[PDB]
Amino acid sequence: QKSYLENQLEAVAEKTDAGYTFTFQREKIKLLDGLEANVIKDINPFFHKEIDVTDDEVIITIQPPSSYKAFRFMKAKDKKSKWQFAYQLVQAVQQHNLSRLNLIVAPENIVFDKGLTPYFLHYGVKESIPPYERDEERVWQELKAAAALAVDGAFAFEDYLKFNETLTFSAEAKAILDAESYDDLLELIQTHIDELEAKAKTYIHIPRKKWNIQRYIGLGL
Amino acid sequence: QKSYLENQLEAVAEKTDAGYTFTFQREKIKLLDGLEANVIKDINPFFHKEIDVTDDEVIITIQPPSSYKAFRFMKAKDKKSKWQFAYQLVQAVQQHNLSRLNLIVAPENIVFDKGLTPYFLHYGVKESIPPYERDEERVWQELKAAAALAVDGAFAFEDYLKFNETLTFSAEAKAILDAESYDDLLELIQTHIDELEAKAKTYIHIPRKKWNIQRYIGLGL
Amino acid sequence: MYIDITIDLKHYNGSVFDLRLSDYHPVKKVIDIAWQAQSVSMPPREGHWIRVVNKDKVFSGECKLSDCGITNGDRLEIL
Amino acid sequence: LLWVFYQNNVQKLNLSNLPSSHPVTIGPDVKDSVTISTIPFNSGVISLKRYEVFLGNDCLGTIETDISFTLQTDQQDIRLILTGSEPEKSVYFTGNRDEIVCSSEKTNADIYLNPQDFAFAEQSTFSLLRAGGSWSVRPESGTIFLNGEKINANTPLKPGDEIFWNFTQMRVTEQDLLEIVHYAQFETALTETVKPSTEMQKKYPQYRRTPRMVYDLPDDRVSFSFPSQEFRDKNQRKKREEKRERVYKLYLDNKRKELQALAEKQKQVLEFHFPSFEQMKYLTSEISDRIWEKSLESKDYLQLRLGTGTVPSSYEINMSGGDLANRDIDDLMEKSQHMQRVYKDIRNAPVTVDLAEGPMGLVGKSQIVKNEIHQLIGQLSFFNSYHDLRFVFIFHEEEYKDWEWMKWLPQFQMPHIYAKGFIYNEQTRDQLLSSLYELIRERDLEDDKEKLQFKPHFVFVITNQQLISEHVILEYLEGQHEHLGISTIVAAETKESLSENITTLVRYINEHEGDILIQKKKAVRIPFRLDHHQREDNERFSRTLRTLNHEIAIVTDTGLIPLS
Amino acid sequence: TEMQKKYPQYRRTPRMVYDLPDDRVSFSFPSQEFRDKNQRKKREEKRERVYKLYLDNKRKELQALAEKQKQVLEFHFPSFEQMKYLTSEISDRIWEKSLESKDYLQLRLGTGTVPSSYEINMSGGDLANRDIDDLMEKSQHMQRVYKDIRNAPVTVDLAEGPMGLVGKSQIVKNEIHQLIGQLSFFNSYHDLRFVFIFHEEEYKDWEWMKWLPQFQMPHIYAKGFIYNEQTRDQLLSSLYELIRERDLEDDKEKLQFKPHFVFVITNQQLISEHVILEYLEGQHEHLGISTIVAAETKESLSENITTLVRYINEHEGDILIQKKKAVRIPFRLDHHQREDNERFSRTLRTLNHQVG
Q1: Based on the domain organization, do E137 and E253 belong to the same domain?
Q2: Which of B41, B122, D238, D500 is least crowded, fewest Cβ atoms below 10 Å from its Cβ?
Q3: d(CA B56, CA B66)
Q4: Which family, according to UniProt (chains A, B)?
Q5: Could you tell me if E303 and E191 lie in one domain?
Q6: CB spacing of C54 vs D544 below 8 angstroms
Q7: Is residue D212 part of a domain?
């Protein structure tokens, strides 16, 4: 098999105790000198990064602190946290400013703090290593699917991105996948978060032991 | 009655539907030509800004979007969100990169959005307007003090700043005030957030109305 | 008026020494005098440009030293 | 302006500074107005008059404004272009930007120069690129001239370089302010701004004193006090103590606020009066108005900062109140006692020593004292004009490459003979010290000794194994003629090496700690901690302090050598 | 007025004087904190009412001292408009002071807050181990209130040494009118004289001073204005010689010279290389001179300055240095009009002062 990133970048990637690694074939890139790659060091300075060059392949390694975690771990938490994470992701994508570094968004390429702010591991370069062109249409297409999968999912990241006609997707999927601009998506998320904020006050918190005691007392007749 | 800013900047600040405003008398600052203040427009793009320069004084107007709130409203939220916001503030201060703009920290000069990420309104321009020089020890002190109000909030802002050595604060504020470096403070916050994430699993949330029945129906018998 | 300046030849037979000269001389004459003093080989790079090290500034080979502001104590690194 | 273009180079010249009596010339000799070395000019010498073009005895016509004239000689080509207008000035701020594209072929460039708007616009393009806090250039088409020479490949850009492109000049400054000078019009989208300035920076080559600002320490007295008194039964007891609690809490809050204010004021004054060495560098960088603020008339000159530590307060606290021995220490007793200690002494404040009270000594391992003397010398130099203070310095020959940066300061220049203040060997010693001793003798032999204040105050610093142990001048350096405007500092590894007449002494224990142990000729002890320090910026500091105003020959430390 | 009977002539009469209040006020608290009504609750009224009466009796007092202080302060330093009025009718307050008096060369700059001259003393103390309450809190309230005065005149002296005015040129140039107006009234032309320096472009604004009596030079017939190189070269040399011949006598610190000169400078370029700058910059205050200087900012002033005043905007200002110490005292500006100056100056010009 191949991941969405795998076919787009033709690279080999793995995770190991030395951190994340990506590999490219020197014959399949426009890189000439190698010292051009130094620009990578000018983003996320608190990460640890290293690059080396050989006539046949090029290898890039990145190692973030120990507190961060991959994307798949998000599935366990509640729904409020998921909504807030989607909001953070959108607002982060909208703020990219530099010109020589290109974004690619996918579930294999994301990490997040304990504060729920996300980060991107790998970036392209304008001329040397892919993706070369700072396109926008594909970025938006990817972001919609990423948010849709973040909030919930019974499907792979491929399904939302490629098609909407395959199956009977939930109401939230249909609502999120149909937005015209960033402001509209932010508006769609704000009301959902506020509704959950309103709901909470109608509940009360009780430890399990006391509720079990009350159940025993009730059953004692 | 004067906020913590006025005693230092010698500038008035209020809220109006046009947006927060600041005013400096010309003789109180070293500025010579109004063009010098144009640099402020590049630091944060989507906050609408405006600058005016009369022969009497300088006026700065900042008008953040609709859904951004002032600092003081945070008091109503639960503990875990307070911890997450406290964690966010440290990272926000840490990553300041521009070498020509300086920071001033205080609850009067912060706004936070639905993601719980703060944003500063006023900035200093080197050798032109009051917050002249990047004094990092002052920022460290102010950040350490301000985290407590978010986490504990027992006393006024100046109380955690000036009269620390004498009073007997709670355990949490004392622990926060002991930190010696950024990494130590972040490590401190990590354990507290983990404790809450673990404890909450013991409870269950039940509609209070149904529990109101369940708790009283078993009477008389 | 007289001034005293320091001249660096690190590009051409690295050496250091200081001269006292009248202010109104042009820049190229300083280079000529330095060449006379050390008897260095090769002609200078065309244009007779120089750099003032302790100011981060550059001047062409046509200044009059009184004009573009080369007073006492400045270091002249010959390009 | 008159431009000249030849193979792979471009030069500039101004004509308005000369009358028509001087024929503008282009030739090989330095005497010529424009010099070229690679072209032999075998046919003749190019010249102009009025313009009229003449190659030696030959005539080639005339030149008109805003049009190019070409001519050939020695199988090579030369151009001439003449303009009389003057350019404009502007500044832009880059900020977060990572690339700047300049072109006249594409309208999407950040800075667009329409080719039609100027007579000699040419199709070209190039870009600036940033990486790791540094700027670099990268040509793409047309031509570019850097420092007057063409380039063809990616090149790093150094702080003072100047770029030339289509009669436009571009310069960069760290912090990323971009400056442009042009005879043209171009569209733009960058943010415009201007550099900060003051009066002193505008009068930079000249300097003159300004009125001084002085603060006074907080002198005050405070009063304090602490408690001294020791259904039916329930209501009787607790409420009185509750009233006690409330009242005493209010009283304590008032006193706490007052003491805090006083302590803060004292801290602020002490920090203001004695800044550290790094602050002196930074102030000198911007030409602040505090340079050379003190003078002989003032009292607080010749005062040095050694480090930071603990200092006693200058405001009295009358803790006496009521007699404590009456009864036991209660909780209120304990709170009052706890507050009594805290505000008695300030913490992390400058520790200061004076030099005007006689010879000073230093003790410790050699390396640390050697690394420390720099602070004292710099601090003394920052606060005094060279019209009043002059140095003399002795040291080991081997250490010369570490002590060199001080030779450029102004205070080291002797007042009566053109020679530097250093001393290496016997020759220089016999050259200088004899004259210095003779000059001092006249100061000693005069009745007005007590009345006058001799203008240049010599500060002797001695650190070398005594090559001076047998010279006559030691008669005065022994330290009994301090009214002669002379002072001393010494260094050694043990106390016994120094003399017995010292009136102040210091000692360094390790990398970060030290203490006084003699002052005012009496035994004392105070610990303190050293400051962080850097030693790679000294040359710029000294050279900057050299410039301020307040025949050919070589110059050396011991005289002048006429050239040839 | 009665003086109008003598309008062609004028002669001084005995001066009036006053003094500030300086008493000390004390405090005292000699007390602390079916048949119940008639026996002890009726005595509570007697116990309590006396202390409220005592507090009100005390309150009656501090205001009298405050009023006395205010009354004397606003009597010793009248504003400029009040002086126009007092001159429109020939009062006996014209030319009060004389060289012997110590308070001449004092100027009023505006109105502000001033500390009280009387002393408030808390002798009772005993704020701990005591059931402090209302009858003790009123003492704190009174201490807060009556410790200072509001809307009193702020004063500055000029006899100590050169002053300096800083701020935008328009406002600082406006205020010299008021300062010279104040100075011109208390002192006779037999004792004080002026010398003025300014730009030739503003000759119309300053014309009203042309007719004051003090501007006539004593030594040689001339008017003490300076336009340009011609007048400067015509006048300054004689003044230099006048200062020099005085400086050559050994009694420079034991006797006094009658005519006293006051310099006002706003344009340094016109004299930037002249010899007199030596006597002006140097410390020769004992020779019988003075100086006032105005400029854009601090950096354009020499080292002799002892007092510095800064004007911010159309209404307010503050002091910076007094007696070489660093201070910060705000004050607000007066209000006045410029049209009447001709009549005031001309009326003063006519009053021939008969000696003896």
Answers
A1: no
A2: D500
A3: 31
A4: Belongs to the EssB family.
A5: yes
A6: yes
A7: no
C62 close to C26: Cβ distance less than 8 angstroms? yes
Residue E352 lies in a domain: no
Contact B207 A203 (CB under 8 A): yes
Residues of D in contact with A123 (CB under 8 A): none
What pairing do the DSSP bridges indicate for beta strands E291-295 and E260-265? parallel
Question: Looking at the structure, do residues E128 and E190 belong to the same domain, yes or no?
Answer: no
Does residue A64 have a cis bond before it (omega within 30 degrees)? no
Cβ atoms < 10 Å from Cβ of D445: 8
Q: Give the start-to-end residue ranges of the domains of chain C.
A: 2-78
Domain that holds residue D31: 2-82
Domains of chain A as residue ranges with CATH: 66-201 (1.10.510.10)
* D553 in reach of chain C (CB within 8 A): yes
**Do D254 and D272 share a domain, yes or no?**
yes
The beta-carbon neighbor of B33 closest among D175, D194, D339 is D194
Q: Which residue of chain D comes nearest to E127, CA vs CA?
A: D251
| CATH, residue D149 | 2.60.200.20
Which strands make up the sheet holding A48-53, listed edge to edge?
A12-16, A19-25, A57-63, A48-53
* Distance in Å, alpha carbon of B217 to nearest chain D alpha carbon: 39
E90 and E166 part of one domain:
no
CB contact under 8 A, C19 and D205: no
Entry resolution (Å): 3.8
- Any chains having at least 3 CB pairs less than 8 A from chain A are B, D
CB contact under 8 A, D161 and C58: yes
> For D549, which DSSP code?
B
**How many Å lie between the alpha carbon of D247 and the closest alpha carbon of chain E?**
7
Asked whether C and D share 3 or more beta-carbon pairs under 8 angstroms, the answer is yes
Chains D and A contact (Cβ–Cβ under 8 Å for 3 or more pairs): yes
Residues D389 and D333 in one domain: no
Enumerate the β-bridge partners of residue C4: C20
In a domain, D201, yes or no: no
CA distances from D164 to B39, C52, D9, D171, E89 (A): 27, 20, 11, 9, 77
Q: Which two tokens stand for residue E22?
A: 């300086």
Tell me, yes or no, if E164 comes closer than 8 A to chain D by beta carbon. yes
Solved with: cryo-EM
End-to-end CA distance of chain B: 63
Report phi then psi at B171, rounded to 5: -70, -40
**Count of the separate structural domains present in chain E:** 2
Interface contact E100, partner D, CB < 8 A: no
- The C-alpha of E292 sits at a distance from chain B's nearest C-alpha, in angstroms, of 21
Cα distance between residue D546 and residue D526, in whole Å:
37
DSSP letters, D154-219, are: -EE--TT-EEE-SSEEEEEETTTEEEEEESS--B--SEE------HHHHTTTB-------B-----
Q: The domain spanning residue D553 has which CATH number? A: 3.40.50.300
- D65 and D148 both lie in a single domain: no
Which position has the token pair 């150094």? D158
> CB of D358 within 8 A of CB of D482?
yes
The contact set of E with B (CB < 8 A) is 167, 310, 312-313
Of D49, D82, D115, which marks where a domain is finished?
Answer: D82
CATH class of residue range C2-78:
alpha beta
The answer to the question of residue D216 being in a domain is no
